[PDB]
Design an enzyme around this catalytic site. Structure first.
Site, PDB file in Angstrom:
ATOM      1  N   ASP A 416       0.813  -1.078   0.183  1.00 58.11           N
ATOM      2  CA  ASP A 416       0.021  -0.004   0.033  1.00 58.11           C
ATOM      3  C   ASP A 416       0.749   1.158   0.030  1.00 58.11           C
ATOM      4  O   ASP A 416       1.947   1.173   0.207  1.00 58.11           O
ATOM      5  CB  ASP A 416      -0.677   0.006   1.147  1.00 58.11           C
ATOM      6  CG  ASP A 416      -2.155   0.876   1.114  1.00 58.11           C
ATOM      7  OD1 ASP A 416      -2.302   1.594   0.104  1.00 58.11           O
ATOM      8  OD2 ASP A 416      -2.904   0.778   2.267  1.00 58.11           O
ATOM      9  N   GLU A 419       3.140   6.771  -2.484  1.00 63.83           N
ATOM     10  CA  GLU A 419       3.146   8.062  -3.337  1.00 63.83           C
ATOM     11  C   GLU A 419       3.573   9.344  -2.775  1.00 63.83           C
ATOM     12  O   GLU A 419       4.403  10.046  -3.522  1.00 63.83           O
ATOM     13  CB  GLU A 419       1.519   8.050  -3.674  1.00 63.83           C
ATOM     14  CG  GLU A 419       0.699   6.827  -4.002  1.00 63.83           C
ATOM     15  CD  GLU A 419       0.184   6.120  -3.062  1.00 63.83           C
ATOM     16  OE1 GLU A 419       0.638   6.437  -1.877  1.00 63.83           O
ATOM     17  OE2 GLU A 419      -0.514   5.262  -3.443  1.00 63.83           O
ATOM     18  N   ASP A 482      -8.812   3.950  -3.564  1.00 60.31           N
ATOM     19  CA  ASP A 482     -10.087   4.205  -2.649  1.00 60.31           C
ATOM     20  C   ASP A 482     -11.184   4.913  -3.327  1.00 60.31           C
ATOM     21  O   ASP A 482     -11.299   6.286  -2.818  1.00 60.31           O
ATOM     22  CB  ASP A 482      -9.441   5.383  -1.290  1.00 60.31           C
ATOM     23  CG  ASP A 482      -8.392   4.495  -0.385  1.00 60.31           C
ATOM     24  OD1 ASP A 482      -8.028   3.185  -0.590  1.00 60.31           O
ATOM     25  OD2 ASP A 482      -7.615   5.293   0.315  1.00 60.31           O
TER      26      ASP A 482
END
Lengths: 773, 773, 260
Positions: A416, A419, A482
């Site tokens: 996950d 970024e 998301d």
């Protein structure tokens, strides 16, 4: 980035120079160098007091032409660089004449015009596919901010449309859009992307990779309406034009050049269920979910533990929460006995609360500011720091934690985040922070991938990855991040899915039912059908559970129906997966990619091809109304068996157990005999289904083995009213359904029976022949 | 303008507040006011130390709901304001319940939800067409630049596309783009526009006008992908949701609200030729073009004198150059005997060189800086000043000059420029300069229009206008500016034409052959066919002439053929023109507008409907290849008479005398008997054409008089194999062609003759019945 | 240094966060650690995207309680440090109940209240001698000068007067005075001092040493009239509450700690 101010003016404070005239051409081995002046330099009086551009053309791979255009060569230029496969002796042609300097690789050449009329043209066998007109590339000196930029604008013809640039959630076709290739955590609802790739392709059958890991600012028909502009803060600009001439061939060259999608294990293709995010979970909750799936006869193949497997505020420290999971090895051992595969959440950051933080700081494993202190902020975790993966020692410490989880029974990792990488820092290896921002996603995922490769074996490595950069498609399974629980977000998620495959990624998932908010049952139902008809299928939520019984009982039937279908579809699907690995052709395909010649397909973003042969169109309405386009041919619903003629749009209404899933004509499709798991002996008990074989056509079906190689080939050739069927390889106990054929006139080499879907022919050998009425 | 920083964050330095909870609702006559707090204010302790939003809902016209969201009311808020038609007594419904506050006009309502879950929904008979979700409107305190903004984001559904926002040259469908409504002189090749309109509409059948003449910044699916966001620097935001439920019905309401396109005189529909821009020209040059056109039998209806009718550097002082035009009134009188109409170039600026400049400076007629000095710069003309049109005496002075040109025999004016209006100034009337920038185009064009109205008469008034602002569609003929002589720019101009019609404008021209550069002959030829099939047809160039013999021999045949065709199509065209005047339906219509329920039409931008019945698809290649889409039905080529079936795409190859021009089924169309001029007695000698009259349908054709009214109506009704033709009104010596019908069984009350296109019947009276073979 | 702008507001461009809720308590040998969130983090949905304070309580000598309140631990933090006599084996008691986390050395304890009503109290034999009320400590992000501070305000009761802070020539009782601990050559006729010491004591028989050799900015009943505020440019603030209960007893512990 705005350079012009309309057609007539330049933005205030920008000074521009352009390569306007060829001064000299030189061949250096297999590369062509062109020196170009920004003004008329034919007279010696002008051959001083001027800038000069150096343009180098080269080929890293057949049918890819590299263009490097440079101002100053003395700049620093530190890595990292994209992990490009650069061959050294690609066969090339260099022609230097009175009129032109022309560099050719395969069918693709770059031609610069000498004399008073400068032109840079990219030709496919002498035909112009794009290029740069005079004053549409060069150097920008920005006196407002003292930064200097290199830029290029590549022509778009009449009706030319642009695709890709990563997983983006804006309109599928890029014309009209500004795009900055800069990884962010912005969800799925905006112009931002978790996964940025400075590659685009067009419906004219070529692509372009802009070879710069830092931010590239594309103005795709958004500043100059009939050009793709791209610019970068640099003393040089380097880009690659990639020949097709089809979108699939461009992607073949592109993935050969930047990396092939790995082939994920067949098990990863089943149904994944998670704990959801900020919900409660412990062993009892998990068992509750697994058991509840079993008691409802819902196949489940992968279970995933989200962030709260670790203590709050200590995320990514790899320590199980002792009050929630007091026996981690035993738990995973119990859950594995069922045959379940196990995933756990990780990321590349660490909260200050973790006892491990202090160890990492002392050891110097965390990203530092230029003064030597730790880089920290309070987003995601308190006093959050970042693992510096340019430090070999830090990489080893992080890899080791992961091996520990593998040794306890975890099969894969949800990689996950990755970024929001800051630039006000100093990397262990002194890398350029502007380039590390995006390239960190690659380094991070590559590290994780390599741990699995070394422990479970390459064949068994899979990730669920949120962020990416050029090359990361080698480390499959990417998920759309998301999203929200409504139809608009389901649709934006699909745009991102299409886009990522148009950017070189073969496998893509999305949170079924939506991540944020709780969907009404209808939305969850519609989304289940979409999710199980994607390459990878995951039920995951933010604050609520995604088990079908949290919605309604019809939802259990929906999950059941489509999970069974996907498992029965595995012989077709896994062959399609091997195609991503071999040719970089994604499993979820934009209509423009599969039907590049069809002008009706240019803007289609609500439907897709799942492999070569099946068109899927998710239903974005409660009432079940849906409109979709079918390319030329006669299509057949995969299970309803109804037929539709193509080259036109269609309107239908579907219940929750249905959606348009239409099979191409001239198709031979393998369905398996197991609807309980994706990983089974696909070539035993195979039910082959032939769809609208026309006179003069041959339909081929390759049944794969667990490793993706072809183990059996069945072919059906129609000659008049005779169809000859030949098999080759290894298959047992298979069957052949003649779709919408109720009666036949003749049959050598086998027996017949009626089915609702049509005549079912059981062979004696692999050398049968049918004669139609 | 960027407000969010992805889904999760806000741009640094911005403080946002939003209406989150209804505090009080009140009905003030026929308006509904909602007071909304940015936090929970149910308890008295929180009913202080907080901002409060005041939302006012009102209806200026049936089926339009105005929404005004304010923070502070104490702001200055000076004019100018948009020239809106605001009614005081629209029948409205207001309902205040415990759940909702709802305001309804016609079928359209605005509904706000009370309690914990704020929502603002726009409903069409109780069905939500769009709305604003919580936190998607409110106030932006930008602490970086110390400016404050108001903003709104209106939802877009799945597959919902956006159109309009003025004459724009980017991709037709706006999703994915940023749009600033700020008039600029940017040519046709960028994101910039001469003609900005903060009105958009969608394929869901509503429109919205954002009621702010200053810069409005739209992010159309480009910040939030499923929303249209607009913001403005103001203490209040006011916008209007405009009901359809059809695009034509949206434009009908919008143009009743902001202004109806005037009906141009029939002569303006013929062929316009100019001197070109910076070419040479004098009376001999002009005669040579006019005689040149006559000798080749090329009908010409309007001649235009560009800028060099005045002395260089003196532009817009209205004085003929006495070395180039020593006898202006004699010249134009001579030019008029030959039947021609005369246009001359004007603009609203003046160069310092002119002897008139001093007069204007002493009188105080020119735009001033705040210190009382003249505003000047050197773009366009040296020491250029701007006529201050808020000064009543300056207006009179400029209008009298124009009256001077009319008394000399000028028929109409080219109202060029009007876009680069500076804001660092003080207007005579004290107007807000931020508002004056766009509105100046209105005031300027209004002024020129009223000169025409008062001299030649309303029915004779026509302009060729470069810029525009809301309401300026009342002053027709707008042309798409300085395009380039190639296919890409011909295509971008078409996108602009389509877009202006989708923003309220009825009539639109473009420079045939391209403005800048000299087209290769093939491009000129393709453009001639497009131009002559546009509402308004003008030959105009930058540095070269646009007479067809400058290109090749065949260009003269091309101009001749399509001019003759246009003159023959006038009975049909002028009727369609009266439609733009009555309902605001433009002559050149995007496919989506004519076929709003066809999902194949959403993105079509290389073809259009010319009026109700005729599809045209300009050809954008040398070789003549062209792809186009046909909606459902059986279409017939207007002159080739071939038939094609709809609901699909087609590919053809056309020579220079041809392009796809297809007539829909169930059409009765009128062609006239004069191919030499557009203005003639359409209802005498009329040739009617029936296309594919299906059993049970009825085709209606209305032939217009010179003022737009219907002078004769012809109806053909198919009952079985019997078709009843009945006329009403005034017509003479007309015929009816049965297209693609060779032979008939019965004919009661007419004669018959074969023709190459079908049976031609000549009636005995207003009532024929025909029996199919 | 001014932080508040009256009772009701904050100086412009200052952003404040405060330890408002016990998240976790941990005993680490002879030390007590309290994790405290600047908001309600009872639900998992709020257990991310937030700062978190780390308070450590320890005792360097009998009757002295050290309090260290910190935000980021990654900052540089170089010497020199005050020449403190720090013992490693002072006898202490730690109690971690449902209501309280309490750290005790001799007769002096620090007690933090768990749940909805945060409180930091200094107790002498269980009686409150002073303390920090909710929102009277924390971190200041000064957006005007790009500097960050930690601060604390210790209560003063009715008639409680403040003394010391070095050799200073203003009124002897400090209530009402701003004092910056920064050596200067200003003579004897001003607010400036040649000899600065960030230690004060009160007529209620305790003292406090703020453990920072850099400039410590004290507002002694001069910003909040019933508190002694002290703030330091730092990612952590560390102070010692020194028990008496008599002035001479304070100074006995104080000089044992810092030098006789």
């Amino acid at each position: 980035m705005k350079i012009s101010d309309g057609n007539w003016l330049i933005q205030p404070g920008l000074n521009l120079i352009h390569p306007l005239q060829v001064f000299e051409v030189e061949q250096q081995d297999n590369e062509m160098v062109v020196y170009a002046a920004p003004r008329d330099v034919r007279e010696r009086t002008w051959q001083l007091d001027t800038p000069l551009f150096t343009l180098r053309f080269f080929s890293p791979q057949e049918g890819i032409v590299g263009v490097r255009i440079e101002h100053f060569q003395g700049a620093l230029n530190n890595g990292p660089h994209y992990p490009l496969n650069i061959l050294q002796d690609v066969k090339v042609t260099i022609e230097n004449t009175e009129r032109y300097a022309e560099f050719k690789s395969g069918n693709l050449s770059a031609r610069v015009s000498k004399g008073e009329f400068w032109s840079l043209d990219f030709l496919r066998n002498g035909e112009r596919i794009t290029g740069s007109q005079v004053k549409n590339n060069g150097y920008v000196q920005d006196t407002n901010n003292q930064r200097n930029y290199m830029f290029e604008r590549l022509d778009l013809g009449v009706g030319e449309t642009v695709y890709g640039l990563g997983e983006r959630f804006t309109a599928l076709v890029r014309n009209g859009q500004t795009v900055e290739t800069w990884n962010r955590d912005g969800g799925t609802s905006t112009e931002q992307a978790y996964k940025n790739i400075p590659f685009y392709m067009t419906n004219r059958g070529y692509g372009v990779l802009v070879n710069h890991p830092q931010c590239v600012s594309f103005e795709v028909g958004s500043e100059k309406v009939s050009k793709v502009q791209f610019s970068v803060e640099s003393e040089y600009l380097e880009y690659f034009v990639i020949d097709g001439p089809t979108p699939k061939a461009v992607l073949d060259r592109y993935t050969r050049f930047t990396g092939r999608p790995a082939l994920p294990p067949a098990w990863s293709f089943g149904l994944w269920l998670t704990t959801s995010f900020t919900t409660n979970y412990d062993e009892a909750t998990v068992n509750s979910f697994i058991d509840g799936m079993a008691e409802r006869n819902l196949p489940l193949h992968v279970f995933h533990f989200d962030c709260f497997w670790m203590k709050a505020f200590q995320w990514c420290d790899f320590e199980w929460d002792p009050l929630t999971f007091p026996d981690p090895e035993g738990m995973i051992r119990r859950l594995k006995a069922k045959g379940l595969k196990i995933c756990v959440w990780i990321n590349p950051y660490i909260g200050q609360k973790s006892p491990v933080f202090k160890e990492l700081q002392e050891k110097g494993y965390l990203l530092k500011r230029p003064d030597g202190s730790l880089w920290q902020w309070d987003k995601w975790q308190p006093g959050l720091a970042i693992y510096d993966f340019t430090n070999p020692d830090a990489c080893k410490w992080y890899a080791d934690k992961l091996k520990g989880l593998v040794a306890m029974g975890v099969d894969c990792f949800k990689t996950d985040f990755g970024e929001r990488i800051p630039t006000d820092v100093q990397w262990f290896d002194g890398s350029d922070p502007q380039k590390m921002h995006n390239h960190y996603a690659y380094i991070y995922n590559e590290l994780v991938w390599n741990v699995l490769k070394d422990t479970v074996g390459e064949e068994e490595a899979v990730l669920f990855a949120r962020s990416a950069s050029v090359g990361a498609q080698k480390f499959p399974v990417h998920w759309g991040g998301d999203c929200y629980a409504n139809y608009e977000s389901m649709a934006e998620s699909l745009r991102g899915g299409l886009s990522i495959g148009l950017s070189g990624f073969g496998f893509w998932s999305h949170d079924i039912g939506g991540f944020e908010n709780t969907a009404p049952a209808h939305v969850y139902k519609r989304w289940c059908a979409f999710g199980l008809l994607s390459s990878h299928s995951r039920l995951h939520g933010s604050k609520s559970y995604r088990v079908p019984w949290a919605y309604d009982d019809e939802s259990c039937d929906v999950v059941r129906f489509f999970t069974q279908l996907k498992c029965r579809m595995m012989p077709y699907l896994y062959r399609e997966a091997a195609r991503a690995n071999a040719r970089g052709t994604p499993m979820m395909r934009a209509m423009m990619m599969e039907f590049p010649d069809d002008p009706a397909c240019d803007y289609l973003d609500r439907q897709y091809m799942l492999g070569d042969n099946v068109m899927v169109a998710p239903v974005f309405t409660e009432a079940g109304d849906v409109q979709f386009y079918l390319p030329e041919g006669r299509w057949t619903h995969l299970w309803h068996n109804d037929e539709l003629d193509g080259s036109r749009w269609h309107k239908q209404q579907h219940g929750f157990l249905s959606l348009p899933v239409y099979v191409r004509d001239n198709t031979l499709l393998a369905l398996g005999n197991n609807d309980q798991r994706p990983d089974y002996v696909w070539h035993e008990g195979t039910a082959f289904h032939l769809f609208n074989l026309q006179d003069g056509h041959e339909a081929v079906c390759e049944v794969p083995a667990a490793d993706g190689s072809v183990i059996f080939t069945l072919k059906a050739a129609r000659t008049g009213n005779t169809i000859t069927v030949t098999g080759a390889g290894e298959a047992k106990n298979w069957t052949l359904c003649l779709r919408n054929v109720v009666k036949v006139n003749g049959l050598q080499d086998g027996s017949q029976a009626e089915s609702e879907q049509g005549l079912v022919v059981k062979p004696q050998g692999n050398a049968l022949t049918i004669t139609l009425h």
